[PDB]
Design a protein around this ligand. Sequence first.
Ligand SMILES: Cn1cc(Br)cc1C(=O)Nc1[nH]nc2c1CN(C(=O)N[C@H](CN1CCCC1)c1ccccc1)C21CC1
Length: 311
Amino acid sequence: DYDELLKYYELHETIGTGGFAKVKLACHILTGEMVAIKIMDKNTLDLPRIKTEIEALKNLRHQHICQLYHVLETANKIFMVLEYCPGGELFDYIISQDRLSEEETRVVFRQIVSAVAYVHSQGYAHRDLKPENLLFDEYHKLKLIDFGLCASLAYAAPELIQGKGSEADVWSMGILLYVLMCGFLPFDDDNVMALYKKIMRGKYDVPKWLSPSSILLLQQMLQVDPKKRISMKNLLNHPWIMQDYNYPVEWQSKNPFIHLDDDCVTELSVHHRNNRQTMEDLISLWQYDHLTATYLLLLAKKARGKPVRLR
Ligand SMILES: Cn1cc(Br)cc1C(=O)Nc1[nH]nc2c1CN(C(=O)N[C@H](CN1CCCC1)c1ccccc1)C21CC1
């Protein structure tokens, strides 16, 4: 139940619902930082989905991946405390704009490619890429979410639906690119089997406002045969991707966990009136408990150019 969570967080409103989970806005008491808490019920659960996401996020640390802070499991519930992104979903952003210019699309799309390339570099495929799974953070940069399916029909690759992961992610990014520049899906139908057929055929409308280079890139990402599909490697430095930037997508993590931050370690030891070495030792266990949560939220203060202070 909520007694364990309420020790550390003030709970606010529900900001999202899923089939088996909800996400609530909350504030971390010790740091005053806003967070987003994904809440699951262990009775009405699937559960492998939760464990999959948790394991992935413990191993992924990247400027375009929504950060995990804290995992709490009670008798009845599982709580995942995640980064709060105050800019909302990419999908809702596209609808409000109708569609994005090629220029703004490229700004956003390069961030998606950065995240997904990194995910692949760490040995995973996301498998559920869609604009509902991309959020805008405090600096209006994109953060990828929902790793429950890592190793929706409108975004699934032909070979994935066929049951015949890396290439499947490229296809989904092709659908995303189309939606960004067009404001609607390339394959859509009320009838699910009719949608399946359309995806298998691979034919789609090419709107009048797409540039020849955009058209070519969509063609290369939306190849029905995954062997003919552009590879992640060649996506990183694609001429469309390079335009106006003149350097390939920077996919490597810019915020990896190397050494513990001295300033964060000191603030925790001072606040808790604890032996510094004991504090450094307990943080290093990386249990994703309240200690880890407080440590990581202090690091976020620092990344924001703010002082590392508690209470
Ligand atoms: C929608 N919105 C509007 C504003 Br302003 C901020 C947000 C917002 O969602 N912020 C936010 N920050 N961090 C998170 C979110 C939403 N959020 C989510 O994880 N949201 C997903 C959203 N889905 C995509 C397809 C269906 C479910 C979710 C997953 C399970 C249950 C409910 C929601 C995270 C927790 C990591």
